[PDB]
Structure 1
Amino acid sequence: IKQGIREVILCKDQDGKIGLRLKSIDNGIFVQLVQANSPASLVGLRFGDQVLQINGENCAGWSSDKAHKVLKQAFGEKITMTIRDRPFERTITMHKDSTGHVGFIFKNGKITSIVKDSSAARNGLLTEHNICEINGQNVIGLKDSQIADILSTSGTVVTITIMPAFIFEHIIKRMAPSIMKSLMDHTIPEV
């Protein structure tokens, strides 16, 4: 989680699209969905991200409907956005043991238990937290088996980005779980 506000310049695709859905939370506007292969993913917008401004207009108190509206009525040429990076999330780094375990049980993305003497324990991982990303990759809507596969196919060092479930549940709300599985950008970023 990069601590600060950064600026991104977007450009609508051939189809007029930017690949973004935004959700109103606590009188801000947050990224609910980033579509793979979109101007939004290229410029590196992330699920969870706060949008403070669009085109220099403040977003405070905007509905989702309204933020969606504004994006459609902007010249594709240059959409400036000012972004606070994943303010609702934290990242934990952990080490697998000899037996290739970090030390927790989870279900539907939600960590539900932590195991004694594990790295999960030593690093103070919490239950009631939804997994957002592993080792830099968005894992939301993937099935547990897939999430579990990512964890085995990772090095010894595992980095998890987590979000309190109450907040996660407020964000994905009004999002059908297939759009997540299919459309939500699950790719390693591109250099």
Structure 2
Amino acid sequence: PREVILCKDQDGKIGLRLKSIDNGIFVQLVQANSPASLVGLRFGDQVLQINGENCAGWSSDKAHKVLKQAFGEKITMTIRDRPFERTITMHKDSTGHVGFIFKNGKITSIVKDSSAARNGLLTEHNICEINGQNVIGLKDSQIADILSTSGTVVTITIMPAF
């Protein structure tokens, strides 16, 4: 786990939304060019403590409350970098495709005899990055376009959908 110190922007904002999952707190959205992005926060990071207080069991509503009510300009956090993450490298065939359907940023079926099949891609998982590009918060058509334009090698990072 690592310590990070976020400095609030002039607006009072750090550019971070947190979510309650399995009685922990997880990074859910990191805004571009924000205090949160500066210190290297990503979707799926786990927040163990904020200003010395355990996040365990906090609701999403609470976590938002605690960040909003943080006195002062610096907020300290203890982070476990994305603990649930599987990165799979596939390769396009002459479908020009890798072999999967997705919807709302989540994989929904695996095509038989495809590189996604050969490489054990899993359904009910969120797509987080494609070839090093963050796709959290993108539209399905934007993800499809990144896949369409990709070279043969497609490396995807996934997480459980929780």
Q: Is the 2:108–2:124 Cα contact (8 Å) retained in structure 1? A: yes
Pick which of 42-51 and 107-116 moved more.
Answer: 107-116
Instruction: State the alpha-carbon separation in 1 of the partners of residues 139 and 153 from structure 2.
Output: 22
3-state DSSP of counterpart to 2:19: strand
SS at match of 2:3: strand
Superimposed CA distance per residue, residues 67-89 of structure 1 (whole angstroms, 9 cap, x where no aligned partner): 22222333444322111122233
Aligned equivalent of 2:154, options 158, 178, 181: 158
Q: 1:61 to 1:128 in 2, by over 3 A?
A: closer
Task: Assess, with a 3 A threshold, how the Cα gap between structure 1 residues 146 and 78 changes in structure 2: closer, same or farther.
Answer: same
Deviations 1:100-139 (A, max 9, x none): 3212122332322222332111110012223222123332
Q: 1:21 to 1:118 in 2, by over 3 A?
A: same
**Bigger shift: residues 39-48 or 150-159:** 150-159
Name the residue aligned to 1:94.
90
For 2:68 and 2:105, the matched residues in 1 are separated by 33
Shift of 1:32: 1.9
TM-score (norm 1): 0.73
The structure carrying a bigger helix percent of its residues is 1
Q: Aligned pair in 2 of structure 1 residues 83, 56: CA closer, same or farther (>3 Å)?
A: same
The 2-side partners of 1:102 and 1:44 are apart by: 30
SS of match in other structure, 1:41: helix
Change (3 A) 1:108 1:78: closer
Distance 1:61 1:159, change over 3 A: same
**CA contact under 8 A between 2:24 and 2:58: conserved in structure 1?**
yes
C-alpha contact 1:11 1:76 (8 A) present in aligned 2: no
Q: 1:145 and 1:43, CA in 2 relative to 1: closer, same or farther beyond 3 A?
A: same
Q: Which has the higher strand share?
A: 2
Paired residues of 1:20 and 1:33 also in contact (CA < 8 A): yes
Q: CA deviation at 1:98?
A: 5.0
Q: 1:156 to 1:75 in 2, by over 3 A?
A: farther
Instruction: State how many pairs are aligned.
Output: 158
Q: TM-score, normalised by structure 2?
A: 0.84
Seen in structure 2, the aligned counterparts of structure 1 residues 133 and 154 have a Cα distance that, compared at 3 Å, is same
Deviations 1:14-40 (A, max 9, x none): 111001111111111111222222111
Larger mean Cα displacement after TM superposition, 11-20 or 113-122:
113-122
**RMSD (CA atoms):** 2.0
Distance 1:97 1:23, change over 3 A: same
Mark the runs of 5 or more structure 2 residues left unpaired by the alignment: none
Q: Unpaired segments of 5 or more residues in structure 1?
A: 1-5, 164-191
